[PDB]
């Protein structure tokens, strides 16, 4: 189970999808420390490059095993191995763009393998995404709770814009273990604080290096009820 996830882990990713009507594929390879909640991925746009849309909208599609599940929070994702798990997500942007994504996470000969499929529609042609006027994501907090057989996550995200503003989107995700739910120690409601940063890019955003830090916590504020 959890013992399959070592202190250092490597990952390989394949991605294919469409945004509005533009098809593309990406690959990535990286490594991280799952229990410290840190990871780096080196990402190539291998088909359909350069993308006519901001690479930022793909950022959260490139890794739940690398979350520091501190403070005795049962780790739904690390428990899921060797079988692995899937996630499905809809991201709704404030200006009409909608990006759905589905992902399969497996463990193959000690390497984490990601299979991601993207479908984004109705991104406005004069918006910052299609005009590529974005500058990465702010830090954020996801709320996760047991639901629908697995875990449900909700989290608003703020995309920085050229010129100083933000474009807001909302993420609604379902995480499903490939292990029967009865064979898992389920967590309560908990939160994941994240900071995702673009470390490097090259060649019209066809090569991107990304780093993420993610730490899970319960509410740390005092309680009058228990």
| Residue 95: CATH number of its domain | 2.40.155.10
- Whether a cis peptide bond, with omega within 30° of 0, leads into 50 is yes
In the DSSP assignment, the letter for residue 184 is: S
Rounded to a whole number, what is the distance in angstroms from the first to the last CA of the chain? 32
For the four alpha carbons of 86, 118, 32 and 198, in that order, the dihedral sign comes to negative
Q: Long-range contacts: 217-224, Cβ < 8 Å, 24+?
A: 217/70, 217/71, 217/73, 217/190, 217/191, 217/192, 217/193, 218/71, 218/73, 218/188, 218/190, 218/191, 219/191
The structure was resolved to a resolution in Å of 2.0
Q: Give the bridge partners for 31, in sequence order.
A: 10, 40
Is residue 53 within 8 Å of 123, Cβ to Cβ? yes
Q: How far apart (Å, rounded) are the C-alpha atoms in residues 216 and 110?
A: 24
The method of structure determination was: X-ray
For the chain, give the number of residues. Answer: 226
Q: Count how many domains the chain has.
A: 1
Is residue 123 within 8 Å of 93, Cβ to Cβ? yes
Domain extent at residue 54: 1-226
Nearest to 109 by CA among 11, 8, 7: 11
Torsion of CA 9, 34, 4, 151, to 10 degrees: -130
- Burial bucket for residue 202 (CB in 10 Å: 0-12, 13-18, 19+): exposed
Q: How far apart (Å, rounded) are the C-alpha atoms in residues 140 and 193?
A: 6
């Amino acid at each position: 189970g959890e013992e399959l996830i070592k202190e250092n882990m490597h990952m390989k990713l394949y991605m294919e999808g469409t945004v509005n009507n533009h098809h593309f594929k990406c690959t990535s390879e990286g490594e991280g420390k799952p229990y410290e909640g840190t990871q780096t991925q080196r990402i190539k746009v291998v088909e359909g490059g350069p993308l006519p849309f901001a690479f930022d909208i793909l950022a959260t599609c490139f890794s739940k095993t690398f979350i520091n599940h501190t403070q005795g929070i049962p780790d739904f994702f690390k428990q899921s191995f060797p079988e692995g798990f899937t996630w499905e997500r809809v991201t709704t942007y404030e200006d009409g763009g909608v990006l759905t994504a589905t992902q399969d996470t497996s463990l193959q000969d000690g390497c984490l393998i990601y299979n991601v499929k993207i479908r984004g529609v109705n991104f406005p042609s004069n918006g910052p995404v299609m005009q590529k006027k974005t500058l990465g994501w702010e830090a954020n907090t996801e709320t996760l709770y047991p639901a629908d057989g697995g875990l449900r996550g909700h989290n608003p995200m703020a995309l920085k814009l050229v010129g100083g503003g933000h474009l807001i989107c909302n993420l609604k995700t379902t995480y499903r273990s490939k292990k029967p739910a009865k064979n898992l120690k389920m967590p309560g409601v908990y939160f994941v604080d994240r900071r995702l940063e673009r470390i490097k890019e090259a060649d019209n955003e066809t090569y991107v290096e990304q780093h993420e830090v993610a730490v899970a916590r319960y509410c740390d504020l005092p309680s009058k009820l228990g």
